[PDB]
Each structure stands twice: as C-alpha cells, then as structure tokens.
C-alpha cells in the first residue's frame, strides 16, 4: 500500500511542478493596462414576487425570457420576466428542492433536492397541465445541481460524492462520474455540451467528460466547500465560489489557478456564480445579502447589487446577457439590468 | 396597452397567484418538526406512537397538523443541507439511554452515548437553530432499568459520583445534555422520558410546540 501511496505522492508533486512551470505570469499581471469597467450600477427592473419560502435555484430559458424558480414552498414557478407573469406553478412532490433547470429546447424543467430524485416535468403537453414526465432515481444523497444537455439527457450532481448522466427515455444512468471525495454542490455544463465541471465539498473542482465518463482535470486551491460553479462563455475557464468567501477562476488548458476575487471586508460564503455574456463581469451571490460584481480580468468589485433582505442563494445571467436575476431566501427574485 | 391575449395572460397569472396564496395560508397552518435522531438510537419507537432520503411522517393532534422529516437516512454532510430546515417549529432530538455502555460498531473506540453528545453539541449551538426549540427525547428507559444494574454509569462518564439507582442516574444524563445548550436565552431544550408503550409522547411534543407558537405569535404582534 505504501508503494502506491508514494507513487501517488510522487505523481501529485509531479503535476504541481508541471503547473508551476507553465505559470509564466499571473493573470493579474498581464491584464493590468486594460481599462477597468469603472462602476457597474444595476437597478431592480422587475421583482418577480409570489414565492412563500426561500429560493435555492433559478434557470433562464434559452429565449432569455422565461425563468424557472424553485422554493421550499413546494412550487416550481415558471416566470415571464418581461411581464412578471406566472406561466405555470408546478407543485413539487417534495418541498425540499435545492436545484432546478430549464431544458435548452424549452419543453422540460427538472427539480431535485433532499429527496435524491430528479423529477422531469413536461411543459408542452396536450392536456394543458404540467406532468411529471419521469422521476429519476438512483442517487443515495441529496441532489444539488441538475443541468440538461438535450431533451433526453440530463446531468445531476448529488451528495453521493458522484455526478451522474441520465437518459430520460430509459430512466437509467448511462454514465456515472466518480472520483470526488466530498459532497458535490454544483455543476456547470460547457457551451459545447461535451465537458462539464463539478464543485465538491473537498475544495476541489473536477472537469469531467460526458462522452467518456472519467475526470479529465482536477483543480485545487480553495479552503472550504465549493458552493457554486459556472463555465466561462468560451468554455475554456470556470469560476468557483466557496464558503471561504473567495471566488477563483481556473483555466482548463493551463490546468491551474488564474485569479482570486477576494476582499478583506467580505467573510460570508458565495452561494452562486454566473458569468456575463462577454465573460468580463463575474456575478457572485454572497451570503451578506449582496451580489458583488467582480471584473474577471481585474479582480476589482464594480457593483454591490444590494436589494435583498436574506441570502442571495441563486442567480443567473440570461443567454443574451441582457439581465441578471438574483433569487434569494426572502422569496423574491429581482431581474437586475444596468441602465444607460 | 394590453392585447386581448396579453389581458388573458394576466388573468392566468392572477388565477395562479390565488392558488399560491391558498396553499401559502395552508402550509403555515401545519407544524414542521425535524426528527434529527442519533445513530440508530431511537426514531423508531416514537414514530409508532404518533402514526430514499427525506421521509415525511404526517400526524395530527388537537386540530394541529405536524410534519416530521426523518433526515437521518442521508449519510452526507449535515452542514450542507441543514439550512433547509432553518424555520422548523422544533427539533425532535432522540437519544437512547440503552447506549450508555455500548460502543459504536463502525468505530469500536467511541461510546455510542458519546456519539450522541457530539452530534448534540454542534446541533444545539448551530448557527441556524438559535431560535428553534429542541425537544430532547430519552427513550429505551425500560432496558436502562436492567442495564444500569449490571454496569454503573461510570462506563460513559467516570466523573459520575452516584449509585446505580434510576432516579439519580437518569438525572445526570439529563443534566449532561443541559450543559451543551449555550443559547440559554432564546431556546430551552425540553426533556422527556418515554418507554415503548406510553401514549403521552404526542402530548409532550404538542406542549413544547405550543410554547413555540406563543413566542412566534408574540413576535408578529410587536412584543418579544
């Protein structure tokens, strides 16, 4: 066993030297002469109200007009962000829901949580009422993040220290991803839908391969549980938020840290991370009722977006980058948008 | 400013909003209790009296509907999902007196009672359960009668100074759990002894739930 342990320790040191060799200069050093964004001030354009409990997830539709929010009330409302209309109100089987998703085609929405079951709902049906298309079972831990690839493929990351890929038609896990040692709290799907990362509680983020089924790269650097993750718009980077009150941006090709977005006056942990359309603004949802906007190339806060009473648990920028909703534990979503 | 279809879309939203309000004024009527037991200590004797992850046991007493969520099934980290329960009326903790000498099967080094104390330590002073009450339950007292005769209470606590009689041995165990309660200003942890046949367990939970309802009602009015 010691032989393997030493081979391990030796291999771990080998990759550390490889990462050190490739780090010619830090991301902050090179991006020093660029003009900073200045001061990004955002106003609450809409306040989607009607939830009766905390909010742990939201996902914008591909049209950038419909968003689905999940709450402890047991309701999964599909809002209409343009006119604040509740298109649907799906009553969940289990009120303990910690994740939600909108299918890229706009036909399905998925929810999951402490019930360890990912439920797929069919929005477009002849009967006119949303029905549970299929309940996906096979996880022995709380489900924390589910994201759709197509209308028949969904990736779920749960408390089973594993992430799984499902075939909605059959209802079984075609590919199961293993390797994490701690609870997996969030996952992000690449724009090409060929790779996806996952943020685990062991302060490690692993880049998986959906087609193959094994971890491609492992990223370390955090000091606490990684509570959120999101891909860069170009798909060659991702940002991790953790209870350490630090947001960190890694690179897939460099396979090492690039920058850390930290501040001495911030102690609460990040609950949600989402980039902008251009990949410059790093919206992050902290637990101090703020949504500090971090310049991803300067690591300087450019906004506070302080309009919430309780924690900003979930947030997401639209596909056209025209708005950034911020779900929160005070049962109110707010569609922020920077005016001219 | 609103089209014929747009006007009807708003009517759909208004109809949807009423259902949420109707289901929001009904969920608040129910009482949510988190049965956060120790490692295979209780959680089986009490649930029989009051009727793959979260399992919900729904029972009613005195025109009050209680929802009980046995979360002990999950083996994941407690901290990452326990904020979901912030807002429960009370926490029905369950400790078995019969484990005062038994050792953990998975560890064989740590006493089973000491395992319960360790979990109570973090839970009682958790950052989410400063206001929520804790209904501590001490079951399996029938077997505790015979077990204490064979072995004294010094097996778990060598600092104990007393005889093997049930009156003072059980009181020490109660006093041990009173110690770890640090927030002695906005939370009093209720204690109760139950066998496998008494039907007063539901009544004790209701009595402790009512004292939380009064505190919640006073907060709404403006006092407290």
């Amino acid at each position, epitope marked *: 066993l010691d032989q393997l342990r030493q081979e391990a320790e030796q291999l771990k040191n080998q990759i550390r030297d490889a990462r050190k060799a490739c780090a010619d200069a830090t991301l902050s050093q090179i991006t020093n002469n660029i003009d900073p964004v200045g001061r990004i001030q955002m106003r609450t354009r809409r306040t989607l109200r009607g939830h009766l409990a905390k909010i742990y997830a939201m996902h914008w539709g591909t049209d950038s*007009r*419909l968003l689905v929010s999940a709450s402890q009330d047991g309701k999964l409302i599909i809002w*209409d962000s343009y006119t604040t*209309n509740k*298109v*649907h109100a799906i009553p969940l089987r289990s009120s303990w829901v910690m994740t939600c998703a909108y299918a890229p085609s*706009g036909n399905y929405v998925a929810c999951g949580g402490l019930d360890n079951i990912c439920s797929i709902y069919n929005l477009k049906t*002849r*009967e*006119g*009422n949303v029905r549970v298309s299929r309940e996906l079972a096979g996880h022995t831990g709380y489900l924390s993040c589910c994201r759709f690839l197509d209308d028949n493929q969904i990736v779920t990351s749960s408390g089973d220290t594993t992430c799984a890929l499902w075939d909605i038609e059959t209802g079984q896990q075609t590919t199961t991803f293993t390797g994490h040692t701690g609870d997996v709290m969030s996952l992000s799907l690449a724009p090409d839908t060929r790779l996806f990362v996952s943020g685990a509680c062991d302060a490690s983020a692993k880049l998986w391969d959906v087609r193959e089924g094994m971890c491609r790269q492992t990223f370390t650097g955090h000091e606490s549980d990684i509570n959120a993750i999101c891909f860069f718009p170009n798909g060659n980077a991702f940002a991790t938020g953790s209870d350490d009150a630090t947001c960190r941006l890694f690179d897939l090709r460099a396979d090492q840290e690039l920058m850390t977005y930290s501040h001495d006056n911030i102690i609460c942990g990040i609950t949600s991370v989402s980039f902008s359309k251009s990949g410059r603004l790093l919206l992050a949802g902290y637990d101090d009722f703020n949504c500090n906007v971090w310049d991803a190339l300067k690591a300087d806060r450019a906004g506070v977006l302080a309009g919430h009473d309780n924690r900003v648990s979930c947030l997401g920028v639209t596909d056209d980058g025209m708005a950034v909703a911020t779900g929160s534990w005070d049962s109110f979503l707010k569609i922020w948008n920077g005016s001219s | *400013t609103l*089209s*014929a*279809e*747009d*006007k*009807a*879309a708003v*009517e*759909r939203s208004k*109809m949807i909003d009423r259902n949420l309000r109707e289901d929001g004024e009904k969920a608040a009527r129910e009482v949510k209790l988190l049965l956060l037991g120790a490692g295979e200590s209780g959680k089986n004797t009490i649930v029989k009296q009051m009727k793959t992850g979260i399992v919900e046991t729904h029972f009613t007493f005195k025109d009050l509907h209680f929802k009980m969520f046995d979360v002990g099934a999950q083996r994941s980290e407690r901290k990452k999902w326990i904020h979901c329960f912030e807002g429960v009326t009370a926490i029905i903790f369950c400790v078995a007196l019969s484990d005062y000498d038994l050792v953990l099967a998975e560890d064989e080094e740590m006493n089973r009672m000491h395992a319960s104390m360790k979990l109570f330590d973090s839970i009682c002073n958790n950052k989410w359960f400063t206001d929520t009450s804790i209904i501590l339950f001490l079951n399996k007292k029938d077997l505790f009668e015979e077990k204490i005769k064979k072995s004294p209470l010094t097996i778990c606590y060598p600092e104990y100074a007393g005889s093997n009689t049930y009156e003072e041995a059980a009181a020490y165990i109660q006093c041990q759990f009173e110690d770890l309660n640090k927030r002695k200003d906005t939370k009093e942890i209720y204690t109760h002894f139950t066998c496998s046949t008494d039907t007063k367990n539901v009544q004790f939970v209701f009595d402790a739930v009512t004292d939380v309802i009064i505190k919640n009602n006073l907060k709404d009015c403006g006092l407290f």
Partner: single-chain antibody
Amino acid sequence: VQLVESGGGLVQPGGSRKLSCSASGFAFSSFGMHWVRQAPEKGLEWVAYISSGSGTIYYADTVKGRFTISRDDPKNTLFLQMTSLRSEDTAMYYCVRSIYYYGSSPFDFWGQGTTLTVADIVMTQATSSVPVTPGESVSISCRSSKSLLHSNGNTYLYWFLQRPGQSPQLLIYRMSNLASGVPDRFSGSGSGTAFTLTISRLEAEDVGVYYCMQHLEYPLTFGAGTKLEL
C-alpha cells in the same frame, strides 16, 4: 382531447335551447372556451367566450344581451343558453378550447359540431375558390382593416382548415408559428397588413376552406374563406 357537444335540433322561433359541450381528456378548468358557429354554405363567425375562472364573458355584438355562456369546471361541461332564437341563428355550433400564456396555442382543438335548424376589424380574402393540383405551391392571402402587429411584436392571426365533414384545424397561429401535429409544409407569414399563407407540397388531405382570424380586438372576425379544389 375530445370535445363532444349536444343539444342541437329543430327549434321554433322565439323558443329556448341549451347546448352542452362535454370536455374530456384535458384540463378543462385551465382552458378558456370559445363558441363559434357557421351558417350553412357560409363561413365562420365568433359567438361568445368564457375564461378559466370565469371573469371575462365577452360576447359578439350580434348576440350581446341575448346569449349567455357559462362554464361548469367541476363537471367539465360548457353551456350556452339560447334565448329568442331568430331566423338568422340557424347554424352549426363549434366548441373551441384555448389557453393564454407566453407561447401558448389558443384555438387549438375544435369540437365535433352540433347543427341548429331554426369599428370591428374586417377580414376579407380576395379569392374564394383556387383550383389547385397536388405538387404545386399555392398562397392564401387575407386582408385586415388595421395592422395586427401589437407593440409586443405579436401579430394576432390564426389560420384554420375545414375539410368537408370535419371540424376546423389550427395550422398557423400568430401568423408565424405552427400548431401541434401540423405538417411542416405549411408556413405562414405577412406584415401587419400584408397577409398571406403558403403551402409547399399539397396533397389529397390539404383540401378544404381556409379561414383567417384576427385576435387583437376581441370581436374575433373571421375571413371570407378560401376554398381549395382538387
């Protein structure tokens, strides 16, 4: 989904009659209901409308103050009280379901049909009979009094096809989008006033009469009706 109606029959003028529309196979309480009648050897015209959770009972001008439409959600049945049945009232009445939200498909399903034998937007079609053959593309054009392009960007046009001895079927809604199950060969288009509908590969099942709806103003006036001949 299946809407079956009953209550039609011969009625003397000045009498009374009740039409019942039985809704089965879909969430009736969540669907707004319309009543549409069609005079024999003529087109369609809107009659009444009731909303889910009745709070909007808009009628047609020619029947306003004389016809009453009521829905019974618990039993899934739609009513229409016939009062002072005039000579013009003889027609075949259709039960229509509709749901209204973002991206919905109103006027989706139509009832089988029950026969009775006793300012507003204008929609006219230049042609009434187009002799066509399978394999060629034919365009059906309607007209409108004013632009139907609301400030939301939606143009409220609904197309329908009524094959002989059959209920109308939705083909194009909002002048841009197909309905459920409709062949992809249909493709609607047009501006607020410039107005047309194109069919690519005509077959033996595409014959019938094409009607165009305006839905911006609730009077809901149909079109003349372009009949396709094999």
